[PDB]
């Protein structure tokens, strides 16, 4: 075999009788999940992987763009055109999508437990499809993904380069419980256990020191950007939540008597910037009742400030908004090859 790319196909446990919008897209666009998935380990093979230059990600992105453009029904779409249209509420909950190769190709998988995502990989295996990956589109925090098997893993195309996005892969997930209560209708909030979070964040920080000399590590809020990225942003049950994460990135509470329950303020927005293409989209207001979803914080998107090498510190601010990086955080241990 050798490295090469080819149009992949998808596969999911999705139902034709479901109103839910991922299922509906999956019904006409993917096949059923592999009813007997087989993994054969390749003995004594060493293989080079690069999660940052992987065509799989571009393809998963293309799907999710298509998925969203077909699924979400904004009242008003804006680009110079203003489009006004039917915007009934939809049920929205992502499901696992798998990505598979056609004939003559196979997907290599890296099983080195401490694999960062660029090196060689010494425990390589071949699959026919990936595992099941939820297409969660959030910023700042990665939600509802896989976990790192052993230590916490810092992932970057190059860490000394401040233009490169950083992916933290947690080895212990942490709950985030976001609720809009019944029944001020756009006012909402998330809760995270102070003690777990702050424990996990101190380990992230310990890991960042290993990468950055023994340079003192600090977090700060984002310096700027659109709302989608200055806030932790995500979709629960069709509603677009925007949540202030100032209190999650608190390096005072790295003694003291401080942890408790950390509650982030949120609000549900109707006018958002579209992640797929150009402009804005206005949505209907929130449905009545308890709007809730409990997600697992499983990774963190960071950017590191530039202009700091003549200095004692490194500063890390939560980021993302390049959704492709959300796919990378799950696809990193895969790569397609061609045979002969």
């Amino acid at each position: 075999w050798k490295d090469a790319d080819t149009t992949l196909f998808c596969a999911s446990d999705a139902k034709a009788h479901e109103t839910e919008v991922h299922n509906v897209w999956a019904t006409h666009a993917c096949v059923p999940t592999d009813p007997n998935p087989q993994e054969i380990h390749l003995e004594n093979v060493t293989e080079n992987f690069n999660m940052w230059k992987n065509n799989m990600v571009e393809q998963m992105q293309e799907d999710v763009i298509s998925l969203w453009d077909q699924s979400l029904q904004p009242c008003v779409k804006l680009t110079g055109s203003v489009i006004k249209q039917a915007c009934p509420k939809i049920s929205f909950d992502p499901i696992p999508i798998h990505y598979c190769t056609p004939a003559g190709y196979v997907i290599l998988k890296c099983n080195d437990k401490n694999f960062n995502g660029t090196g060689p990989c010494k425990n390589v295996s071949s699959v026919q499809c990936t595992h099941g990956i939820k297409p969660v589109v959030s910023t700042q925090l990665l939600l509802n993904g896989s976990l790192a098997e052993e230590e916490i893993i810092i992932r970057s195309e190059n860490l000394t380069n401040n233009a490169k996005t950083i992916i933290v892969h947690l080895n212990k997930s942490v709950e985030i419980n976001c609720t809009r209560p019944s029944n001020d209708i756009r006012k909402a909030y998330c809760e995270i256990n102070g003690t777990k979070w702050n424990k996990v964040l101190k380990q992230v920080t310990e890991k960042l020191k290993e990468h950055f000399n023994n340079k003192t590590i600090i977090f700060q809020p984002p310096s700027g950007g659109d709302l989608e990225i200055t806030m932790h942003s995500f979709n629960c049950r069709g509603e677009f939540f925007y949540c202030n994460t100032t209190q999650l990135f608190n390096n005072t509470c790295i003694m003291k008597g401080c942890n408790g329950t950390i509650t982030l303020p949120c609000k549900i927005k109707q006018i958002i910037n579209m992640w797929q293409g150009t402009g804005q989209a206005m949505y209907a207001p929130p449905i009545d009742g308890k709007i809730n979803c409990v997600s697992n914080i499983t990774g963190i998107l960071l950017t590191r400030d530039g202009g700091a090498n003549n200095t004692s510190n490194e500063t890390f601010r939560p980021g993302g908004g390049n959704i492709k990086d959300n796919w990378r955080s799950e696809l990193y241990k895969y790569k397609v090859v061609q045979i002969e």
Partner: antibody, heavy 120, light 96 residues
Framework: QIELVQSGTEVKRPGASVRISCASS????????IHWVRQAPGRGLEWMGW????????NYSGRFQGRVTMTRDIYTETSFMVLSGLRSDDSAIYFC?????????????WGQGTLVTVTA | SPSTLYASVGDKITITCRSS????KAWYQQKPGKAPKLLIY???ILETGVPSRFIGSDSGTEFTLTISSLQPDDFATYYC?????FGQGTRVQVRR
């Protein structure tokens, strides 16, 4: 014609802010970072920070920081750099530039530059 | 290294910067009252339109701009780049 065109010469009082524009044409605006870089008669070229036009994300130099805000308008393909609490110190020529991926192949092209002089 | 460098039309010259880390180094030329122009990216790749007399090399922790035959236009200031950080600047001047 891939190009960057900046706004003109500024004379600002000590304490004031400047707003410099940087208009893009000839390429897919959201695909390339914009960097700002100054030439102060004294200190070669100094990077001030980067801005990702996709979503407005920024990375500012600590050496300035607080004082620089970088924003863009996707519809006019124009980027903006506000430097605040100006000092004599900040008298310089200010350049926008296109980071081709955003340091890897870059910086090209550059704006013609914008002179800012800080005087009473 | 260093701020001024003196040479004749037609000489080979080398401009050197040094860095702890890697990777990709770039090189810029600037003339008075003008923006910097990109010469070399990825340590050794010519930007299209730039004369092939401009050569970029990179031996790990030390990287260089060579001008294999100095032309009158080449008397100017040269900046090295490594991510955000720039060299002090080397002014190439007429030797006498």
């Amino acid at each position: 014609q891939i190009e960057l065109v900046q706004s003109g010469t500024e004379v600002k009082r000590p304490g004031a802010s400047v707003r410099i524009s940087c208009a893009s044409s000839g390429y897919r605006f959201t695909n390339y970072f914009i960097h700002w870089v100054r030439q102060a008669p004294g200190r070669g070229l100094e990077w001030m920070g980067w801005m990702n036009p996709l979503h407005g994300g920024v990375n500012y130099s600590g050496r300035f920081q607080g004082r620089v805000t970088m924003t863009r308008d996707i519809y006019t393909e124009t980027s903006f750099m506000v430097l605040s609490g100006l000092r004599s110190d900040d008298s310089a020529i200010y350049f926008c530039t296109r980071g081709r991926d955003g340091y890897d192949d870059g910086f090209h092209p550059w704006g013609q530059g914008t002179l800012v002089t800080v005087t009473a | 290294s260093p701020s001024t460098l003196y040479a004749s039309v037609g000489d080979k010259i080398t401009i050197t910067c040094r860095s702890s880390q890697s990777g990709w180094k770039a090189w810029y030329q600037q003339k008075p009252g003008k923006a910097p122009k990109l010469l070399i990216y990825k340590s050794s790749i010519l930007e299209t339109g730039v004369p092939s007399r401009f050569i970029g090399s990179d031996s790990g922790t030390e990287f260089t701009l060579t001008i294999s035959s100095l032309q009158p236009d080449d008397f100017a200031t040269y900046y090295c780049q490594h991510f955000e950080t720039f060299g002090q600047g080397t002014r190439v001047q007429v030797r006498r």
